[PDB]
Subunit: 127 residues, 2 copies
């Protein structure tokens, strides 16, 4: 998977990278800490499902969208991502099963996990 690599970026780093690069950043609208940060950082943003390009370029989704459906949608968008492992926590998945879904991503992505130790754990599950 030369098109995906794994870092440990907090939300401020992810947003700063996304603002500069305009890489697409998926955001689960049920994750209050993240939505709150976005609403305060980009005053006036109208959060709605799908692509919202305002401050940064977001793909807003609900966890009622199942992970493989989200990933097919993102594959069709054909944009480079900055993302957390999809389904992890939001869909009740552990890190290993989120990685299993992430194997279906065909677009380039930077994947952010909680800690440097999670980087090696995640990459081992992915490969």
């Amino acid at each position: 998977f030369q098109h995906m690599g794994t870092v440990s970026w907090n939300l401020r780093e992810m947003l700063a990278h996304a603002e500069e690069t305009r890489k697409l950043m998926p955001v689960c609208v049920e994750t209050k800490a993240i939505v709150s940060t976005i609403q305060r950082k980009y005053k006036g943003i109208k959060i709605q499902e799908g692509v919202v390009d305002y401050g940064a370029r977001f793909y807003f989704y609900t966890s009622k969208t199942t992970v493989a459906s989200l990933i097919n949608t993102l594959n069709d968008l054909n944009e480079t991502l900055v993302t957390m492992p999809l389904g992890y926590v939001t869909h009740g998945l552990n890190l290993e099963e989120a990685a299993r879904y992430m194997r279906s991503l065909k677009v380039p992505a930077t994947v952010s996990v909680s800690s440097p130790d999670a980087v090696t754990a995640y990459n081992g599950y992915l490969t």
Copy 2:
């Protein structure tokens, strides 16, 4: 980040340091000026992706490999590096976003930037 330090060495100085120390030196094969210099200093080299130990010890990569993936690979190799800021220009990144990715390196590294002024800028971005 005590395991990384920043200098301003031109390519000839980087190659001389790499030749003596056997530190691993990442090289983007799309950067034609660098590849040509390497082919001229180390006549007969067979450039191919991955580790090539000929004259100096190189890690040749394509910019189709995403920066975080390259860094994941270099961390797994566990060799000390002499390197330019990864992703800078080659992946369309500015110096600040390259530095953001370099925070993920776990192996010791000497990072060489284009001028003494860039040393100041890069260190501020890294931290």
